[PDB]
Design a protein around this ligand. Structure first.
Ligand SMILES: *[C@@H]1O[C@H](CO)[C@@H](O)[C@H](O)[C@H]1NC(C)=O
Ligand SMILES: [Ca+2]
Lengths: 82, 59
């Protein structure tokens, strides 16, 4: 809840600005986030979590149809209740 | 038919406990079971929830 300044680098999380756009790197933990001026979240993530990370950006598999596996684990046809 | 008695305005629907309420906290009666207005609900194979009075089941 304490507002900090920027940039910021604690706990292996460099919180930087690149190309006038804000960045959050976690290369130890294998991810790089960022935002643009308008607001467009982006998440770069390694190959280490292939068929692991299940969430709102779906699994990191090859397929694209089966990447709605709910918090229970259920292939759903709706992109909404998921 | 068009009967006579004690009703309450259309925005309000009847609750079991004598008052009538909007459809926000109007429970569901799935399989007889009186579920509260927010009760996420599932066996292994189905998936079901009560939103505003209606019981939204899926599979
Ligand atoms: C992903 O992992 C699951 C659970 O272990 C396994 O059932 C499935 O075959 C794997 N799929 C791929 C593409 O490796
Ligand atoms: Ca996928």
């Amino acid at each position: 809840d304490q507002r900090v300044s920027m940039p910021y680098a604690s706990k292996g999380l460099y919180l930087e600005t690149e190309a006038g756009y804000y960045k959050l790197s976690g290369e130890a933990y294998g991810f790089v986030a960022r935002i643009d001026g308008s607001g467009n979240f982006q998440v770069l993530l390694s190959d280490r979590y292939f068929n692991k990370t299940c969430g709102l950006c779906g699994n990191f598999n090859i397929f694209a149809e089966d990447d709605f596996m709910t918090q229970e684990g259920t292939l759903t046809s709706d992109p909404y209740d998921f | 038919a068009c009967l006579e008695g004690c009703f309450c305005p259309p925005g309000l629907y009847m609750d079991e406990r004598g008052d009538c309420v909007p459809k926000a906290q109007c429970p569901c009666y799935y399989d007889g079971e009186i579920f509260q207005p927010e009760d996420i609900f599932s066996d292994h194979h189905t998936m079901c929830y009560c939103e505003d009075g209606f019981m939204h089941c899926t599979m």
